[PDB]
């Protein structure tokens, strides 16, 4: 049940993919730590919530 993932390495020693290991010890998922491997999204629903979305090179009002 060990999950092995890659670390995003910042400073490098003068010594490659370094991995880390996680095992969940509890049945309830609320006990789990955060994996912090989080995806993102498009801001459009806030920055461009327009019915006809127009291209930035074209006039906004036609």
């Amino acid at each position: 049940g060990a999950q092995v993932s890659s670390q995003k390495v910042g400073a490098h020693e003068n010594s490659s993919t370094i991995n880390y290991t996680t095992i969940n010890y509890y049945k309830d998922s609320a006990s789990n730590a955060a994996s912090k491997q989080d995806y993102s999204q498009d801001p459009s629903k806030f920055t461009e919530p327009l019915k006809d979305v127009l291209i930035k090179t074209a006039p906004a009002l036609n």
Binding site: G1, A2, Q3, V4, S5, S6, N19, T21
Partner: peptide, 4 residues
């Protein structure tokens, strides 16, 4: 185990 499961590497990702």
């Amino acid at each position: 185990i499961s590497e990702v």
